[PDB]
């Protein structure tokens, strides 16, 4: 039994050496420490090896990402397959071809891996019964599938979320074991010894909210380290409880343990000396702040021994990751106003608040603010907690960003949260102009849905021109078609094509309406002359070459 | 009217046609060592039928060809 | 038509001007009361708009076919 096991999990197998691991967990303890202990840190070390590269950016040694999509008879596809980058994909499109779907079976395919970190046996979200099965189908019902690769050991991780329709006669299941045994894997190590966990988070379109300025009090449960998986994959990162959380650091900051624990023991010494001779009256209404100094002594201990980062320290982290990402934000910080505290920001020199912010601004600083917030509370053990594992789901990047903001909107991101997965949809040219060609999976304009491959482009739409990008990958025309001045051009084109080359009556009047209309410099003006000047020109090379001889 | 470069700023890859040009004025017109490789690396980044490679090999036969002129004028100039 | 508002906390407060809205809105009012008239349409389109759209909406209080329903949180943004 564990002959084979020891000999393949030294190999490099931590699915061996974690059932070899769970099945010395309840033997007999004492004499087998050692034994299990070897299991217990080499799956250990399997998580947290890693290296700090020439660029100073931890790389972890195994790293965790999807490669490959497969939708079957789900909504609009029929049979589709996606191979995914391992840093960044981007998959786009016209209106109504996938893409959102895409994103969306991610994310109940991710479900189930933050369930079951979560909750021992838990359960992630399913299909929907009602609108993701295909319609016209006459197998009626999909299924979803996934291949995670989590290092050597675990170059492959199957996932299968099935749903059958109504009295489809049949049921499907899904086959979610592979994500529940890495999720247990993850789980109980954690358990046993801190370690950094993936984030997975999905960001819809629906993150547009208006943002409401009254805060829920701080019950006790954003700081705990598994509220980064709560409504994690649900649309809209919970903005509310960024705030909640960076009030309470901001408070924590000036309040600090060293100035409270010192004073409880001081408050100790001097009761316990008054009511040395007796009358402990003054001491028994009072015990309750003498079992609360026990009691600040607990969920004091969790804060050095897991290793968790100081609370001034993940501050300045999240600043840091928001200032350097958001291009108008300057500086954030919680001031007291009314004695309430809010949080203030500076845009462009001036200290507005959040609820003061722009559509535009709040979007993607809720965005980056959330995504940080989560890293930090799941990367307690390494120096840059934006450094860490995960999948980032998120829909329509370029949302309510202006196109000065869309050049810098990937850079920004992508050297915030360096191992961080990133599979977004666009529909801009100008995001596109900063990613490469291999990370674009695009969406043929004549697609019905039966293809079953989406490729990359066959331009390389990094570093090109926007009108490049517009015409061959997103095929829309540099002119709108709808408009008549746009043709105005092409039609003097023509004109000159057609006659010898002078101008005649109607290519004057084309000329005259096109300067007229568009300017003495613009561009289409330009562009005519040139062409007047290259055919004049070109006649008169014929004339030369007609005058040489016959 | 939006103040936005139509290539992006940001992207190393978007100077190398501007950067090229420099190479080959630096030097007279004329292809040499490091501005072949610039030409090869614009050859793998951008492709064959990318307009930057039309253009860059457009410059490359025109300042050919300005040079052959500039020839045929110094040398009936002394 | 002159909308104010003071900031809070302050002793000296603003007021609004808007006796002519009122009384162009009273003109079309009684005028299409004696005699149906066309009325204006007053909407906003805001970013507050493209929530998710499930047809939760039964017992919603209010009448559709009532002709000044279109009114109705037309300035919403959604
Ligand atoms: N159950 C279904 N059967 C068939 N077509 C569907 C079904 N559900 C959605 N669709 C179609 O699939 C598309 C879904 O749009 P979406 O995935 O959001 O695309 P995009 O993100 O590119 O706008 C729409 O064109 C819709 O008509």
């Given at each position: 039994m564990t002959k084979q096991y020891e000999r393949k999990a030294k190999g490099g197998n931590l699915l061996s050496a974690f059932e070899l691991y769970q099945r010395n967990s309840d033997k007999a303890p004492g004499l087998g420490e050692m034994l299990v202990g070897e299991w217990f840190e080499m799956c250990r070390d399997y998580i947290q090896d890693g290296h700090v590269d020439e660029s100073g950016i931890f790389r972890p040694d195994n790293a965790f990402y999807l490669r490959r999509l497969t939708l079957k008879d789900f909504r609009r596809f029929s049979l589709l397959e996606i191979k995914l980058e391992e840093d960044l994909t981007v998959i786009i499109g016209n209106n109504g071809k996938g893409k959102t779907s895409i994103l969306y079976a991610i994310a109940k395919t991710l479900s189930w891996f933050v369930a079951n970190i979560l909750k021992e046996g838990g359960?992630?979200?399913?299909?929907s019964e009602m609108t993701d099965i295909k319609n016209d189908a006459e197998d009626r019902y999909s299924d979803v599938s996934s291949t995670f690769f989590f290092g050597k050991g675990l170059k492959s991780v199957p996932i299968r979320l099935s749903r059958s329709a109504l009295g489809?006669?049949?049921?499907?299941?899904?086959?979610?074991?592979?994500?529940?045994?890495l999720a247990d894997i993850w789980r109980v190590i954690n358990e046993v010894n801190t370690i950094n966990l993936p984030t997975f988070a999905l960001y819809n379109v629906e993150r547009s909210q208006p943002f409401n300025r009254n805060i829920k009090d701080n019950t006790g449960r954003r700081e705990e380290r598994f509220d980064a998986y709560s409504q994690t994959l649900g649309g809209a990162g919970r903005f509310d409880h960024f705030v909640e959380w960076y009030?309470?650091?901001?408070k924590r900051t000036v309040s600090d343990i060293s100035s409270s624990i010192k004073e409880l023991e001081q408050q100790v010494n001097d009761l316990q000396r008054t009511v040395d001779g007796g009358m402990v009256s003054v001491k028994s209404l009072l015990e309750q702040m003498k079992f609360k100094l026990?009691?600040?002594?607990?969920?004091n201990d969790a804060a050095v021994?897991?290793?968790?980062?100081?609370?001034?320290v993940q501050k300045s982290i999240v600043e840091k990751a928001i200032c350097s990402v958001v291009p108008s934000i300057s500086n954030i910080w919680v001031e007291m106003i009314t004695g309430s505290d809010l949080v203030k920001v500076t845009n462009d020199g001036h200290d507005?608040?959040?609820d003061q912010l722009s559509d535009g601004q709040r979007v993607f600083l809720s965005l980056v603010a959330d995504l940080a917030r989560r890293m930090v509370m799941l990367n307690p053990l390494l120096e840059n907690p934006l450094e860490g594992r995960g999948i980032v789901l998120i829909d329509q990047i370029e949302l309510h960003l202006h196109p000065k903001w869309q050049q810098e909107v990937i850079l920004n991101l992508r050297s915030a949260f360096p191992n961080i997965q990133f599979i977004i949809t666009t529909h801009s040219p100008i995001v596109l102009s900063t990613i490469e060609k291999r990370c674009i999976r695009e969406f043929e304009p004549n697609d019905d849905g039966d293809q079953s491959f989406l490729d990359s482009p066959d331009m390389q739409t990094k570093g090109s021109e926007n009108a490049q990008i517009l015409e061959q990958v997103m095929n829309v025309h540099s002119t709108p078609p709808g408009i008549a001045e746009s043709h105005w051009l092409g039609n003097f084109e023509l004109l000159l094509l057609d006659n010898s080359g002078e101008l005649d009556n109607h290519s004057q009047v084309?000329?005259?309406?096109?300067?007229?209309?568009?300017?003495?410099?613009?561009?289409?003006?330009?562009?005519?002359?040139?062409?007047?000047?290259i055919n004049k020109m070109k006649n008169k090379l014929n004339k030369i070459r007609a005058e040489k001889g016959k």
């Open positions: 359960s992630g979200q399913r299909l489809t006669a049949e049921r499907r299941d899904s086959e979610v074991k592979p994500a529940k045994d009030i309470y650091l901001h026990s009691e600040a002594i607990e969920r021994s897991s290793r968790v980062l100081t609370e001034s507005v608040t959040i084309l000329y005259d309406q096109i300067k007229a209309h568009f300017g003495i410099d613009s561009i289409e003006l330009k562009k005519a002359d040139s062409l007047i000047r």
